[PDB]
Each structure stands twice: as structure tokens, then as C-alpha cells.
């Protein structure tokens, strides 16, 4: 940032060799600063509601074992979501719900909106309402594309079986890949084709599992 | 081989794509070391 008071060069280097840590120019060798001083060691309606939303927010978070990380991104959406007063007269749940869901979509992770809902009374519809509604108000389009390759993973772990499934995974995905090019894939709950291909490769791996335990 | 690095339990040659996954392609086992560099190195024994 600064310039040598003599050489008028802009290139500065802090020499760490001899435990000075001086800053110098590679040009004339004059020092900028020696002695490298270093450090060491109210009433708002908005504070209440906000920090309350980090409470309620963080609550539903580790319930789904999502990254605690993503919570902070979602929360600030909630921040911006309050800026338009979109968050006022609706059910607090449905609000923060979409507020988290839109985040975990933006990261392309595996949590499906159906799973997100069943924490509640809710119909996976009222949430479907609120989510699709904030799509309008806060202006967002491109980001949230869900894809099969993610769901099979989080599925695969809960599917018991054995280490074979990894192969099955490698098996199933290439399967699901062609089905997408088999042009049957659109217009479908991605979970459906997910568990579908899973059952497929599982049968192809000659292991016998029910239809129920799958949709579990 | 000459490629980049190795599993822990698989002990298998694994080359990784830039920001691909931290998993090992073969085993589901996660952690991975970095295999030896093919480049020369000099010691003086004494």
C-alpha cells in the first residue's frame, strides 16, 4: 500500500529471519516501519427477533445433521428476508423452513424438502407454498437444481447392506445417468427415481430388499 | 504408481480431480495421505 520514502518503490517485504520482522523495500532497502507493533490475546425489536431466529434456526439445523456452517448463510437470507417484510404475517416455521432449504439447495447438498417438513404437523405443502412464494419476492432463479447423484449417497448409508453398495453406488449412478438421457427423468420427484435406481442396482447386485424398507 | 496419492486402508493409487471429492474412489474410507514425490532429494550421511 505505501511507498518508500526514498526509492519510491511499491514492493515491500517483511523479513522474518532474525526476529525483527522489519518491513523493507526490495528497492533501496530502507525500512518503512520497524518495531512491528502487534496486538495479542441494546433494546431493539430486531435483536430479539433476529437472535431468536438464530435460536430457532440452529435448533432445526443439527436435527437434520446439516452443516452448522450453512446455518449462517441461511440465517442471513432470513435477514434479507425480513428486509422486505415478507416474514411478518406467516407461520414462523414455514418462513425459516424455506430460509434454510433455499440455503442447503444453494450448496447442492442432500436434504429433500419432504424430509425437511416431517419435523412438523405440516403437509409438505404449506412449506411448498412459502418456499415457492419467496422465490418471487427475493429475486433468485438459477441456483437450486436438484439432481439424483446426491440423494443416492445419503440413501446408501441408511440402506444397511454392506460395503458392496459402494460398487452398487458406482453401479446405480451410471444407471440413473442413462435414464436421464433416456428422457424419462423430467416431471418426477427426484427421490422417486433415486430409490428406483437404488432398488434396480440392488437387485442387479443380487441382494433382496423389500419395497417398503426402500421408501423408508 | 506415478500418480498423486493413496488411501489409508485401500492403499490404492488414487488420482483426484480439482475439487472432486475427498473420498477414495475404491473404498468408502475417507482419509488419504499423499504419495511420495518422484523428485530427487539429497542427504549427506555424516
Amino acid at each position: 500500500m505505501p511507498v518508500c520514502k526514498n526509492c519510491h518503490g511499491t514492493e515491500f517485504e517483511r523479513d522474518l529471519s532474525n526476529a525483527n520482522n522489519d518491513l523493507v523495500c526490495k528497492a533501496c532497502g530502507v525500512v518503512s516501519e520497524d518495531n512491528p507493533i502487534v496486538s495479542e490475546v441494546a433494546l431493539e425489536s430486531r435483536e430479539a427477533t433476529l437472535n431468536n431466529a438464530r435460536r430457532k434456526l440452529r435448533a432445526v439445523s443439527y436435527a437434520l445433521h446439516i452443516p452448522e456452517y450453512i446455518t449462517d448463510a441461511a440465517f442471513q437470507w432470513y435477514k434479507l428476508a425480513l428486509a422486505n417484510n415478507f416474514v411478518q404475517g406467516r407461520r414462523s416455521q414455514n418462513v425459516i423452513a424455506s430460509c434454510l432449504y433455499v440455503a442447503c439447495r444453494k450448496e447442492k447438498t442432500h436434504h429433500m424438502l419432504i424430509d425437511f417438513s416431517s419435523r412438523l404437523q405440516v403437509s409438505v405443502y404449506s412449506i411448498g407454498a412459502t418456499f415457492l412464494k419467496m422465490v418471487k419476492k427475493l429475486h433468485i432463479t438459477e441456483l437450486p437444481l436438484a439432481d439424483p447423484s446426491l440423494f443416492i449417497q445419503h440413501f446408501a448409508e441408511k440402506l444397511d447392506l454392506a460395503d458392496k453398495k459402494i460398487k452398487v453406488v458406482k453401479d446405480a449412478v451410471k444407471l440413473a445417468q442413462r435414464m436421464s438421457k433416456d428422457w424419462m427423468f423430467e416431471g418426477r420427484r427426484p427421490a422417486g427415481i433415486a430409490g428406483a435406481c437404488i432398488l434396480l442396482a440392488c437387485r442387479m447386485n443380487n441382494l433382496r430388499r423389500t419395497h417398503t424398507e426402500i421408501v423408508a | 504408481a506415478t500418480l498423486k496419492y493413496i488411501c489409508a486402508e485401500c492403499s490404492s493409487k488414487l488420482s483426484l480431480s480439482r475439487t472432486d471429492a475427498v473420498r477414495c474412489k475404491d473404498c468408502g474410507h475417507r482419509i488419504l495421505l499423499k504419495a511420495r514425490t518422484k523428485r530427487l532429494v539429497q542427504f549427506e550421511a555424516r
Partner: protein, 48 residues
């Protein structure tokens, strides 16, 4: 002694409370991410 440099026994009780400099109460290193640690006097009187 009052030749009144101080001007009698009335300043003994606070009226205008002297805020200390920043170099006495340095804000701790900003560190990675927004909150830099407070440094005592920066919180007490800022509450006062």
C-alpha cells in the same frame, strides 16, 4: 489547597466522565471474521 486551580471540593464527585483514549483500550485484533474482541473499557462506558 484552593487557590482554585481545581476550584474547591465539587469535582470529587463525577460530572463529566473522562473517556480514555483508544491506545489505552485497543480493540483486539480484528481476526478472521467480523467480531473483533472487545477490550474492557470499550464495553463498560459504552454501556454507561
Amino acid at each position: 489547597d484552593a487557590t482554585v486551580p481545581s476550584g474547591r471540593p465539587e469535582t470529587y464527585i463525577w460530572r463529566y466522565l473522562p473517556a480514555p483514549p483508544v491506545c489505552i483500550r485497543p480493540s483486539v485484533m480484528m481476526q478472521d471474521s467480523p467480531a473483533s474482541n472487545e477490550d474492557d473499557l470499550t464495553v463498560k462506558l459504552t454501556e454507561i
